[PDB]
Each structure stands twice: as C-alpha cells, then as structure tokens.
Amino acid sequence: PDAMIVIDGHGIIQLFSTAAERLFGWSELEAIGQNVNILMPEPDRSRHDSYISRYRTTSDPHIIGIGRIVTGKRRDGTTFPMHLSIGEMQSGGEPYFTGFVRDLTEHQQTQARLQELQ
Ligand code: HEM
C-alpha cells in the first residue's frame, strides 16, 4: 500500500491511511478535514490550492499520470523526500484525488553517505 491520502476538489483530506499516520505524524482524526498543504513546506504549501485549481480549469496534468519526487513535511517539522503518484476519481459528482506516497528518505540517506565517502 504505502501512504495513501484522498482529497476532495478543494485539497481537503477525506481519508488518511494508517501508513500515512506513521509517515506524517498526524493521526487519522487530526488529518481529515485539514487541507493537504499541511503535509508540505513553503512555497508549495500556499501555492498548492492554486496548482489544484489550475489543473481543474486547464485539465493539463503536471504530476497526474507522471509521478514526481518532492519534499513532504511531518508534524514535528522535519522535511523529507518522497515519490508521489496522484490519481483522479469522481464520487457524488465531485472530483477526488488520491495520492500514493513512497518515503525516499532511506534512499537519499544511502546516496549522500556513499557520496561523502568519495
Ligand atoms: C505532500 C507533499 C506534496 C507536495 C510537495 C505537492 C506538490 C505539488 C506540486 C509542485 C504540484 C504541481 C506543480 C507543477 O508541476 O505545476 C502539485 C499538484 C497537485 N497536487 Fe500535490 N503535492 C503534495 C501532495 C499531494 C497529495 C497528497 C495530493 C492528493 C491526495 C495532491 C494533489 C495534487 C493535485 C490534484 C495537483 C494538481 C495535479 C496536477 O498538476 O497533475 N498533492 N502538487
């Protein structure tokens, strides 16, 4: 599975997997109802509602159906690398997006270490 988050068309979290709680620091109850931008740092945080709105108006994906590696942010403030896949769905007429996260911290850690030892 890995971390999975579902948001409605406004970026508000509807479902947050147990694995996402483990990864982001927030529990289910706490996360649900919050905007998804609480999972990332600036400048993406303030800008995310616009990326979501730009997509809805242009129908031109930038991450949907491509994937992308980004910096996410846990509750205690630490930032970390993760791979992200976004899926589009529809329910009760309104759009919902699904995000599948893969923690890439260990990889970034193994990479910098191998680098520093020449
Ligand atoms: C948690 C760390 C995340 C970061 C840093 C991040 C960042 C971004 C960035 C940089 C863009 C588009 C910028 C561009 O290429 O124009 C974007 C688009 C979007 N993000 Fe996120 N995102 C995060 C998580 C999520 C999650 C968990 C969801 C869904 C559950 C999500 C849904 C969307 C949607 C729907 C769009 C627009 C779709 C598209 O442009 O393909 N994002 N995000």
CATH of the domain at 29: 3.30.450.20
Considering only the C-alpha atoms of the chain, give the largest distance between any 2 of them, rounded to a whole number of Å.
Answer: 55
| Structural resolution in Å | 2.5
Helix/strand/coil for 27:
coil
Distance of CA 39 to the CA centre of its chain: 7
Dig out the tokens for 36 from the structure: 């998804």
Sign of CA dihedral 78, 81, 83, 85: positive
Amino acid at 79: T
CB 21 within 8 A of CB 27: yes
For residue 12, which phi and psi values (nearest 5 degrees)? -85, 130
62 annotated as a binding-site residue:
no
CB 67 within 8 A of CB 83: yes
CA of 106 to the centre of ligand 1 (A): 22
Strand order in the sheet with 94-103: 13-16, 3-8, 94-103, 79-91, 68-73
Which residues, judged by CB distance below 6 Å to any ligand atom, belong to the binding site of ligand 1?
Answer: 5-7, 36, 39-40, 44, 48, 51-52, 55, 61-64, 70-72, 84, 86, 97-99
How many helices (DSSP H) and strands (DSSP E) are in the chain?
A: 4, 5
H helix or E strand, kind and range, residue 70: strand 68-73
Q: Which domain holds residue 43?
A: 1-118
Breaks (C-N over 2.5 A) in the chain follow: none
Exposed (0-12), middle (13-18) or buried (19+): which is 110, by Cβ within 10 Å? exposed
Q: Which approach determined this entry?
A: X-ray
Which of 6, 23, 36 for a ligand 1 pocket mutation test, highest count of atoms within 8 Å of Cβ? 36
Q: Tally the domains of the chain.
A: 1
Residues 6+ apart with CB under 8 A from 16: 5, 26, 28, 31, 32
CA of 64 to the centre of ligand 1 (A): 8
